[PDB]
Design a protein around this ligand. Structure first.
Ligand SMILES: O=C(O)CCCCCOc1ccccc1CN(C(=O)c1ccc(-c2ccccc2F)cc1)C1CC1
Ligand SMILES: CCCCCCCO[C@@H]1O[C@H](CO)[C@@H](O)[C@H](O)[C@H]1O
Ligand SMILES: CCCCCCCO[C@@H]1O[C@H](CO)[C@@H](O)[C@H](O)[C@H]1O
Length: 257
């Protein structure tokens, strides 16, 4: 049953991800709690944020880079358990599960990223802090170059105004993608992806009645995410080749192997 298929993915989304877009958006607006997030806009406030774990300190731009690794790695662990909560996904052999996570987590991460982003920055520390975009721009290359492209995508992505129910299905479609290199059972995954996209279109018709061309637009965003991630990978291989003092989390090294 497709209606129940969708609802199961929605529950897995709520059960496995720390913050919903509804949570984040209320913070970024200021309705939620009378204590707004602590703004990190420069070195001082960055230091104050740390006061109130990671590899040896090298410098500020690299410190930010490590904080980013921690969030990506943490989000990978949530995507893994969210995917595992999808019965269709757990029926695949374990190696096929790894292939899809290896080549899908980053696409899923930059799509979820938009939920905690606005034109001015993003949330950190579970909504307790807000890092400004101008500050992340002030970092030295190539760390400023690896951050700014995501904001440009996030702002155009938020213009679609998806709610958490849309995103749950949207993320499952990104993970269950038959195009990944080295997949063993392509037709199985192709079928699963087709069921999700069908349920996604069915969902959007109900959830966004007066939103036209929303489904083809999201398919275009999926294509955009492949471009964004591929560019991100090149910049990562740049850091690995030119930033000797910058280490990489082993899990991410396996993804970029
Ligand atoms: O290849 C990989 O996967 C690793 C390299 C990723 C580097 C690029 O990361 C990004 C690019 C654009 C936008 C956001 C991010 C990082 N993310 C965060 O949520 C996030 C977390 C913490 C801080 C932050 C905390 C305290 C002090 C200053 C900080 F900057 C900032 C952003 C997204 C999960 C990817
Ligand atoms: C199901 C448990 C037994 C699984 C044994 C099959 C191992 O396959 C390996 O899967 C990896 C991606 O997942 C690839 O990177 C490797 O090249 C491939 O050799
Ligand atoms: C939690 C899983 C998400 C992270 C996936 C990382 C997978 O890395 C790959 O694992 C394969 C066998 O495990 C190796 O054959 C590949 O060389 C390696 O690139």
């Amino acid at each position: 049953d497709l209606k129940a298929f969708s609802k199961h993915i929605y529950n897995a989304y709520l059960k496995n991800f720390n913050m919903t877009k509804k949570k984040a958006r209320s913070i970024l607006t200021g309705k939620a709690s009378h204590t707004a997030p602590f703004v990190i806009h420069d070195i001082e406030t960055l230091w104050q944020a740390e006061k109130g774990g990671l590899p040896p300190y090298k410098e500020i731009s690299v410190h930010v880079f490590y904080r980013c690794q921690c969030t990506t790695v943490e989000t990978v662990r949530e995507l893994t358990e969210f995917a595992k909560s999808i019965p269709s996904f757990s029926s695949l052999f374990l190696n096929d599960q790894v292939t899809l996570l290896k080549y899908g987590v980053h696409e899923a991460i930059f799509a979820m990223l938009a939920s905690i982003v606005n034109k001015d920055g993003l949330l950190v520390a579970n909504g307790s802090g807000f890092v400004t975009r101008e500050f992340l721009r002030s970092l030295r290359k190539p760390f400023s170059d690896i951050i700014e492209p995501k904001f440009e995508f996030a702002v155009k992505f938020n213009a679609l105004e998806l709610d958490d129910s849309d995103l749950a299905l949207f993320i499952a479609a990104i993970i269950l993608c038959g195009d990944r290199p080295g997949l063993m059972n392509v037709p199985r995954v192709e079928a699963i992806q087709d069921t999700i996209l069908r349920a996604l279109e069915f969902h959007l018709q109900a959830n966004h009645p007066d939103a036209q061309y929303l489904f083809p637009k999201l398919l275009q965003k999926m294509a955009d995410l492949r471009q964004l991630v591929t560019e991100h990978a090149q910049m990562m291989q740049r850091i690995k080749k030119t930033e000797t003092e910058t280490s990489l989390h082993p899990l991410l090294q396996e993804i970029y192997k």
